[PDB]
Every structure is written in C-alpha cells, then in structure tokens.
Ligand binder design. Structure first.
Ligand SMILES: NC(=[NH2+])c1ccc2[nH]c(-c3cccc(-c4ccccc4)c3[O-])nc2c1
Ligand SMILES: [Ca+2]
Ligand SMILES: [Cl-]
Length: 223
C-alpha cells in the first residue's frame, strides 16, 4: 500500500496472507472455511495465514491452515485479468473470534464516491521496493466508470472498477493483489492490477465482487 497508514494489530480481522515460504498475495476470509482472493495469485503449496499483523514474527493470534483446493474462476483470462477471482477452501475451519472474523459479501454493488478500506503487506514505494512487516491500510473512493475507462481505455470490463486518487500518491501495489476492498462492511472489491503504483491518473483496478455473489454462493454450496 503506498501512502497508507499502519492499520493497528488485528483491526482488519478478515485479512489473510497467502504464504508459500514468503507472503505473495492477500485474501479475505468470507466464512470459517473459505477465502476469496485473485485468480492470478493461484499456485500450489498455499498456506493461508490468519490473525496476522507482523508477517515475519509469531506474536500470537495466528492460525496457519493449508488450502485444501483453490478454485480459479473458469472464465479467468490471464491476458486481460477479466474474472480475476479465486476461492480457496481451507483444510480445516478457522476459529473465529474478535481477531479472526469473516467479512460479508455485498447484496448490491457500490456507487462511485463510496469510501472503502484497502489493506495489505505489499510494497509501500512507487519507485522502488520496500515491503512492510505489519499491515497497511488506505481509505480510497470508488471512481466513476468514465474516469476509469478514460484512464485505461479499452482495458476495463464490467467486472472491474477503479478506486484511488488521480493525483497519485496513494494506491495498492504489488504484494497487495488478492486483498480486500471493503465498503460499508461488505467486500466490494479484490485488489487486481494497475500501471505502476500510485502514479498520477493511473488508479488501481479491482475485481467487482457484486458481480460474482451467485457464483461464489453456488460454488461453495457444491464444494
Ligand atoms: N497499482 C496497483 N493498484 C496494483 C495492485 C495490485 C498489484 N499487484 C501487482 C503485481 C505485480 C507483479 C506481480 C503480481 C503477482 C503475479 C502473480 C502472482 C502474484 C502476484 C502482482 O499482483 N501489481 C499491482 C499493482
Ligand atoms: Ca506474525
Ligand atoms: Cl473503452
């Protein structure tokens, strides 16, 4: 997260770190046995790490659970990143408490102007690599579709939305992919892509979760 602030330990109880010997993507806990992340974060050997704050120190509250299966959306396109969503089933259920809690799926999509919270352990520099130990947060608004399409002509599908600041300075960045964009307590987006990080007129692009709720529900119900 570039230009964000330190969240504070366990203040984002639904945030998870996907780990394969190092942190490579974020994700969101939506119930005790399932996590939602981005399809492009897929790989085998994923260990989901819940209740984390400093990802390099065991401070207590952590639960390390292996993924039993990862389900990439069948229509995911790696060239356009359209349908960049994945569901991860955990080998065993997580113990939910105040430090580990799930987030709710939305009932309706959000409107431009809605302020959301984006979090993650990704890079904090736009020009260079500085990876934090603790979780970073950024409050950012959803932009209108015209500003988004005007920023990325021909690359935005109906399953994406832009959130951020056109002046540059604040944005999600590498290491944050797969993580949550929560607005009014509902998971509205998943960190997907962007051009550089925090550059002027190049906002972050997110997967529009409101468009996949029946898919998530049906998929979970059958697995
Ligand atoms: N500017 C942004 N809002 C942004 C957000 C998420 C990103 N994630 C990345 C990213 C960059 C290189 C590699 C990966 C990657 C690729 C495969 C697996 C895991 C991560 C990224 O997510 N850049 C990103 C840029
Ligand atoms: Ca830790
Ligand atoms: Cl267009």
């Amino acid at each position: 997260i570039v230009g964000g602030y330190t969240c504070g330990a366990n203040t984002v109880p639904y945030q998870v770190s996907l780990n394969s010997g190092y942190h490579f993507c974020g994700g969101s806990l939506i119930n005790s046995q399932w996590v939602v992340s981005a399809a492009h974060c897929y790989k085998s050997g994923i260990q989901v790490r819940l209740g984390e704050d400093n990802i390099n120190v065991v401070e207590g509250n952590e639960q390390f659970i292996s993924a039993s299966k990862s389900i990439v959306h069948p229509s995911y396109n790696s060239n356009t990143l359209n349908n960049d969503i994945m569901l991860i089933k955990l080998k065993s259920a997580a113990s939910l408490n105040s430090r580990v809690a799930s987030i709710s799926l939305p009932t309706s999509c959000a409107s431009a102007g809605t302020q959301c919270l984006i979090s993650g352990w990704g890079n904090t520099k736009s020009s260079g690599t500085s990876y934090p130990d603790v979780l970073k947060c950024l409050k950012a608004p959803i932009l209108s579709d015209s500003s988004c399409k005007s920023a990325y002509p021909g690359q935005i599908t109906s399953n994406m939305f832009c959130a951020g600041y056109l002046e540059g300075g604040k944005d999600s960045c590498q290491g944050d992919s797969g993580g949550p964009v929560v607005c009014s307590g509902k998971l509205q987006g998943i960190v997907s892509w962007g051009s550089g990080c925090a550059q002027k007129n190049k906002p972050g692009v997110y997967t529009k979760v409101c468009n996949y709720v029946s898919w998530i529900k049906q998929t979970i119900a059958s697995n």
